[PDB]
């Protein structure tokens, strides 16, 4: 008998994850792609994000 995952992980820091690293801290970049900074920076070239600032 269990009764966890009771508290409403409905909105905010806990209802978010990084598709990859899975963390919740690093700016979970909502712009459509759930990713923290660190992880995104890694995938940038694979997702398709050039630099040339």
């Amino acid at each position: 008998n269990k009764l966890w995952r009771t508290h409403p992980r409905n909105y905010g820091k806990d209802s978010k994850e990084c598709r990859v690293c899975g963390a919740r801290q690093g700016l979970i970049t909502k712009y459509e792609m759930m990713t923290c900074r660190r992880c995104f920076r890694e995938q940038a070239p694979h997702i398709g994000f050039v630099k040339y600032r």
Binding site: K2, R5, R19, V20
Partner: protein, 104 residues
Amino acid sequence: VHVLKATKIRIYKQLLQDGVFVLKKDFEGHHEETGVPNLHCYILVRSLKDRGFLEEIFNWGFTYYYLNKEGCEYLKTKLGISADNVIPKTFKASNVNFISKEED
């Protein structure tokens, strides 16, 4: 946590048919294709990988398992007189080898 017998059966089967099983790192949700309590799918799949009939791979949000040769032997032993004429998809056909040569 008890794992229903039919749950067990239903599961080992969904595998033996395909020879492949997939699961997410989530514990509350229900396995996609089978609609089973994941916690149950975890309890069930792990005993396999652990003894050695299952191969595991993990990427982003999912765990990937492909059945082992020694595994079909195990499942068929557990499923009974039903599992004998079973050929996990991943195990036989070889229709037309197709390692593509780049565009014309």
